[PDB]
Write a protein that binds this ligand. Structure first.
Ligand code: HEM
Ligand code: HEM
Ligand code: HEM
Ligand code: HEM
Lengths: 145, 141, 141, 145
């Protein structure tokens, strides 16, 4: 997927950045920008306004977990299929998430990285991240194929 | 369709873009070409290297079209009339590619206006760009 | 969004559908549920087996809303006002599902009206269903 | 891919498919219904009206090739990847066709089967074909992953 150079670039960037609120912001934004995705998170409580969504503690906590999973992917870029095989089964077979949404979330994450990280998040670096999120989305969709 | 609130969000955000519209149009094109190499095949006549005069000049034209749209939020189909015929009939642009450029524009705006790019504003701009896209794909003839 | 030629094609095709609208609606749902089983999850307490009276009854309702759309091509957003709230805001139906039903309806219509389902008529009906789908997915907000 | 009995059902029905009409009709319908796909067939002569597309001998001839290719995958349902290798590199690395259009053509072929076969193309049979065309599309797109 990534060249060695692209992997090194992604890895170095991910090493330095402070990301403990990024996951919650990405999930929050998904549910605000694409509100059908709220269907999947009824148990999370108040999602009735943009503000309610973004400040919902369950959204923040779940987003942290999602990013932790993404970071796992980042440590196994050679084996995204193996890494997400179980999560693919859960999301497709049990949660019934259409795979287009995996792409939407990867792209929201990129938007979030760009908002948080300014000029270091260059076009070259962002394109490297687009490969990573496309890889994670393909790996999650796998149980559909 | 854009709500009155969305149109407020769009106008306010574009106001914040200020004198940087052309610059951001160029960057969004560069991010599109780099992230989604398949879009480069629509510009085989361009030098697509970073900083090329052609991408710069095209960026400004894309930006100026978006500015025109921002000034015509009550009637996008009317405002984007000629560009719709051009993209659909002449250029036969695959509808997928509008989403790639739109995502590219959101990355660019987020990067440069991180304080103004709130979840509500993000959702408004995403609708605006999808709508513009819908219009530019509204008559393959 | 439909051209004059599109509107004529849709009205003539729906005309040929005639009193078989509800039957074809039921067949389209059946085809959607069988080909794309995740769609069944929006109907958790339905029996969706072949010949289920619930599929037949729901088929009739979908067909009636389509007939209302055909009669109101100049104002789909207004004709489909209540349904858009129901599907986008109340039920949160993922936009993919509308593509799946739209395709299932084209399948059903091609099967039953092979002499009327020309390439031109297929393209107009495709656009009409995409336009109905846009409206029904316009109130997630 | 499909179950052994699903494979039997599809094989039996496919035998009836006329090898030189259906492909030309599916390809022709793709270009009429989704006109941006015409960008790929600039050498094919007049594609300017629906009648021109549908009666274009190059479309008919190319459609036959597409159909023969489907017919081929129909014999290799449990290994669509390798069957569509040469085609995946043609369509992805050389032609840069967005993979969405693979799904679209698969779905046009299914509409075409329906128009030509009518009541015989039952919901259950059509469901099997949806699995087949999704398989082909996924196989064709592999070079993007
Ligand atoms: C990059 C893509 C994604 C990744 C890496 C990812 C990862 C995860 C992980 C790690 C969990 C388990 C968290 C835990 O241990 O509690 C989870 C659960 C879940 N995911 Fe995702 N996910 C992704 C995309 C999506 C999308 C797009 C949706 C829906 C729109 C979705 C819906 C859900 C739901 C409903 C749960 C269960 C939440 C609950 O416990 O109530 N996921 N995902
Ligand atoms: C927000 C969406 C877009 C807008 C507002 C837009 C706007 C424009 C404008 C203003 C022009 C110049 C027209 C003129 O000569 O006056 C143009 C041309 C063109 N566009 Fe777009 N465009 C958009 C999306 C796309 C996409 C997604 C593609 C394909 C990847 C594309 C491909 C082209 C091409 C190939 C030209 C001809 C450029 C040249 O030769 O200089 N456009 N567009
Ligand atoms: C052409 C597109 C569609 C049309 C015209 C349509 C029309 C309708 C109509 C007329 C109703 C009854 C509303 C009422 O009771 O007042 C309904 C309900 C419903 N629709 Fe749709 N629909 C479409 C697509 C979809 C899709 C794609 C899905 C999901 C796969 C869906 C899921 C539902 C559900 C879950 C209900 C409520 C069923 C119940 O009573 O529990 N619809 N729709
Ligand atoms: C989805 C299933 C598809 C199949 C089974 C298929 C099959 C084929 C086959 C068998 C060939 C002949 C290649 C050779 O002789 O080496 C071909 C070529 C080609 N295909 Fe497809 N194809 C598919 C999808 C598409 C789509 C969706 C497009 C465009 C939107 C497309 C565009 C082309 C083009 C442009 C050529 C070269 C034609 C020429 O100039 O000679 N293909 N394909």
């Amino acid at each position: 997927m990534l060249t060695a150079e692209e992997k090194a670039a992604v890895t170095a960037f991910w090493g330095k950045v402070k990301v403990d609120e990024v996951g919650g912001e990405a999930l929050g934004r998904l549910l605000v920008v694409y509100p059908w995705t709220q269907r999947f998170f009824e148990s999370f409580g108040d999602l009735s306004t943009a503000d309610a969504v973004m400040n919902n503690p369950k959204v923040k906590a779940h987003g942290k977990k999602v990013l932790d999973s993404f970071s796992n992917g980042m440590k196994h870029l050679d084996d995204l299929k193996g890494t997400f095989a179980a999560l693919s089964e859960l999301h497709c077979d049990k949660l019934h998430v259409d795979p287009e949404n995996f792409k939407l979330l990867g792209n929201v994450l990129v938007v979030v990285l760009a908002r948080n990280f300014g000029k270091e998040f260059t076009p070259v670096l962002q394109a490297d991240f687009q490969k990573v999120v496309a890889g994670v989305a393909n790996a999650l969709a796998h149980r559909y194929h | 369709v854009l709500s009155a609130a969305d149109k407020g969000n769009v106008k306010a955000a574009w106001g914040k873009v200020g004198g940087h519209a052309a610059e951001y149009g160029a960057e969004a094109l560069e991010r599109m070409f780099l992230s989604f190499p398949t879009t480069k095949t629509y510009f085989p006549h361009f030098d697509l290297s970073h900083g090329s005069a052609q991408v710069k000049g095209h960026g400004a034209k894309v930006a100026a079209a978006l500015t025109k749209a921002v000034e015509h939020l009550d009637d996008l189909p009317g405002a984007l009339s000629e560009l719709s015929d051009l993209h659909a009939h002449k250029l036969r642009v695959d509808p997928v590619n509008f989403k790639l450029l739109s995502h590219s524009l959101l990355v660019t705006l987020a990067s440069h206006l991180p304080s103004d790019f709130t979840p509500a504003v993000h959702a408004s701009l995403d609708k605006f760009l999808a709508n513009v896209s819908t219009v530019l794909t509204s008559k393959y003839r």
